[PDB]
């Protein structure tokens with residue numbers, strides 16, 4: 142026989158994270174390869190596992206690997222990546238970057254997939270996953286007309302996929318932030334807790350894909366918060382015995398109070414439970430997600446006091462596990478007309494009943510989806526993916542969909558950045574894409590989901606990659622280190638003016654003074670210390686009428702220091718006309 146086949150089948154069927162890892166390592170030792178080895182490792186693995194069980198898997202993976210956008214793994218063949226997070230979106234990112242031909246290295250905080258809550262899947266995410274061999278690695282995946290997958294199962298899927306592609310992963314390793322390059326010849330590094338392996342800690346990368354969940358975002362990355370009415374979401378998982386009775390209970394896609402008022406009034410007047418919404422997904426567990434307002438959860442002793450800060454309102458000290466269990470179970474039992482039977486809680490990864498309470502009040506969004514940093518010549522492309530990019534709304538089942546799109550758009554970004562386009566280009570393109578995200582839906586995206594790929598134009602109808610231009614995105618380009626001579630020259634023309642001191646093509650010129658010092662020196666003397674707006678408009682008008690130089694920047698642009706490039710373009714004209722003099 143072939144022992145490798147058993148290693149494979151075992152790897153394939155692994156239901157625990159660390160069993161996936163050991164079954165893969167054994168399969169690897171069986172096939173003269175080591176994990177973490179680019180797409181070449183993938184090629185050997187399928188070279189030696191060309192047999193009945195593996196053949197369709199390789200088939201699907203190959204069909205995707207050879208979609209023109211990857212160039213047979215030559216696109217990002219010179220890119221070095223670090224993905225932060227083994228969440229679905231991180232793994233997905235990992236697969237796209239791996240296929241691109243890049244070196245993918247992934248760090249995950251945890252060492253198991255703990256999460257049982259269920260995610261609604263959009264048609265395209267279903268198809269995608271499918272063409273990654275989802276029913277091979279799961280099989281109970283979206284049976285018939287199922288719509289959703291539990292978190293850890295999705296994690297499992299994409300884990301096996303990323304592994305097979307030779308993505309290098311590290312578990313129990315938290316990324317705390319960046320290490321800038323020590324000197325000109327160096328690269329950007331991660332700071333890792335606790336002990337990074339001496340090779341991971343020394344690993345230099347040029348792309349950072351952060352995919353670390355709702356409440357982690359790197360440095361330079363700034364978040365925009367905005368809340369709605371105070372909402373509190375409770376999710377629950379019950380034992381699913383997969384009995385005939387149990388199976389014959391309809392799901393509850395989304396039953397909202399704004400319509401089913403008599404259902405909810407009935408709930409309340411028979412249970413004291415006052416809800417805004419409830420959802421029931423039938424998965425590995427019976428899953429319920431429901432929304433309440435504060436006064437109900439107080440009245441029922443689910444919460445101990447009326448705390449103003451929501452992060453404290455739903456903290457371990459103020460949440461009463463007893464009551465939240467009884468509340469959850471009561472709602473659950475009512476919405477399903479007891480058809481489900483006497484409900485037992487599933488455990489969380491830690492053994493207490495699977496009921497949690499979350500803050501639903503926020504609609505978080507990050508200002509950008511990417512940034513570029515540059516030191517000692519080393520460029521680094523930061524890009525966000527997942528819950529850390531846009532905060533999903535759980536009832537309306539966004540999460541997976543918008544995260545995967547973010548991940549594709551990140552992979553696209555990376556692809557451009559390998560092709561060697563200017564930082565501002567890569568970023569501008571990414572921001573035009575980003576604009577679309579927070580309002581996406583299957584209805585305002587393309588219909589042929591069968592053919593979705595990295596290329597933005599296969600997914601987003603009426604696509605404008607020019608919505609955002611390199612000029613505006615100068616903010617996202619962070620340089621801590623041809624234009625030499627324009628600065629030197631301006632310093633020369635402006636020496637001697639009392640309040641003027643030229644050091645850049647931004648803040649030096651914010652107050653009008655700077656510009657006047659030039660103009661006055663170039664054409665004396667119309668001739669003092671004016672204002673701020675006054676001086677800027679003085680300079681621009683006078684340079685325009687006297688020197689023959691029309692304004693590139695607005696007076697406000699110059700005053701706000703918003704457009705370095707624009708100011709350089711303006712200045713370069715005084716340079717053109719008067720340098721040889």
Ligand SMILES: Cc1cc2nc3c(=O)[nH]c(=O)nc-3n(C[C@H](O)[C@H](O)[C@H](O)COP(=O)(O)OP(=O)(O)OC[C@H]3O[C@@H](n4cnc5c(N)ncnc54)[C@H](O)[C@@H]3O)c2cc1C
Nearest residue numbers: 226227228229230249250258315316353354527528535540
């Ligand atoms: C406890 C919990 C319950 C949820 N329940 C629901 C639900 O019921 N319904 C729903 O629609 N959505 C739910 N979500 C959100 C859902 O998981 C997301 O919609 C989906 O997982 C996409 O998230 P993500 O991949 O961006 O990151 P996440 O899935 O949030 O995971 C990010 C991963 O990165 C890891 N990580 C974080 N920081 C670091 C670091 N510094 N270094 C290394 N690794 C790190 C984390 O351990 C995690 O494994 C839940 C999320 C959580 C955390």
